[PDB]
Design a protein around this ligand. Structure first.
Ligand SMILES: *[C@@H]1O[C@H](CO)[C@@H](O[C@@H]2O[C@H](CO)[C@@H](O)[C@H](O)[C@H]2NC(C)=O)[C@H](O)[C@H]1NC(C)=O
Ligand SMILES: *[C@@H]1O[C@H](CO)[C@@H](O)[C@H](O)[C@H]1NC(C)=O
Ligand SMILES: *[C@@H]1O[C@H](CO)[C@@H](O)[C@H](O)[C@H]1NC(C)=O
Lengths: 99, 107, 9
């Protein structure tokens, strides 16, 4: 009894095709990229995957911004707590605001 | 410009276009190693200047990141920052100093 | 190097 616009678009010859990549495969690609960039870093984009501990590739990534790597190794817990708090704040910001 | 670490590129003409030849750098053959972030020696934490600490099971070396060139651990390629009771995963090893044998030989 | 010379002397 409450007719929508989708049937009227369908009955006039205006069709919508489905995409080739379903969202399950997009999620699989995203999971592959995350698992590559967590356990290996930038090495999985050049050749094969090169395993490295996370607190050591983070010290590699502080060397790219002009900070020596003792800053991580003397402040690992504080940086981990700040990252976890930022992730939780991103979660709360996505939960609250829908715009 | 290509896959891998970029080295050079060459241009060529084409009908309504251009064609690039990207000469890149791709690592080939890998090997597992045991690594540590720092070395506690004489109550001091030694960190590598450039490269990374690795070990072949028994002895500890320092090498560059993109090639296996193991070198002996020396005060020249390591620097000191603080005590060795704050880094998580620090191991125990000795660090060579080239000044001391020459100073003893001058005596 | 000069503290090493002082310990040398
Ligand atoms: C780890 O590497 C070190 C040095 O690269 C090896 O130590 C040498 O091993 C050779 C074996 O032919 C000996 O002739 C040398 O005398 C050793 N060096 C010293 C200073 O003694 C060590 O054997 C390697 N260990 C493993 C398990 O591969
Ligand atoms: C390193 O160790 C892993 C452990 O499962 C093994 O599968 C792999 O073949 C080893 N060698 C290389 C080059 O990754
Ligand atoms: C390194 O040496 C110190 C003192 O000699 C000791 O307390 C510490 O446990 C040693 N490290 C390891 C991994 O055994």
């Amino acid at each position: 009894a409450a007719r929508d616009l989708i049937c009227a678009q369908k009955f006039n010859g205006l069709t919508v095709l489905p995409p080739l990549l379903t969202d399950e495969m997009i999620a699989q690609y995203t999971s592959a990229l995350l698992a590559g960039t967590i356990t290996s870093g930038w090495t999985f984009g050049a050749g094969a995957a090169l395993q490295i501990p996370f607190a050591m590739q983070m010290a590699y990534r502080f060397n790219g911004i002009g900070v020596t790597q003792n800053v991580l190794y003397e402040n690992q817990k504080l940086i981990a707590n700040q990252f976890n708090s930022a992730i939780g704040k991103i979660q709360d910001s996505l939960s609250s605001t829908a715009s | 410009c290509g896959k891998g670490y970029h080295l050079m590129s060459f241009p060529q003409s084409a009908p309504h276009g251009v064609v690039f030849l990207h000469v890149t750098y791709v690592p080939a053959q890998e090997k597992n190693f045991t690594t540590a972030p720092a070395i506690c020696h004489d109550g001091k934490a030694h960190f590598p200047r450039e490269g990374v600490f690795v070990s072949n099971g028994t002895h500890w070396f320092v090498t560059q990141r993109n090639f296996y060139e193991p070198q002996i651990i020396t005060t020249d390629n390591t620097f000191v920052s603080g005590n060795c009771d704050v880094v998580i995963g620090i191991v125990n090893n000795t660090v060579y100093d080239p000044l001391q044998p020459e100073l003893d030989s001058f005596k």
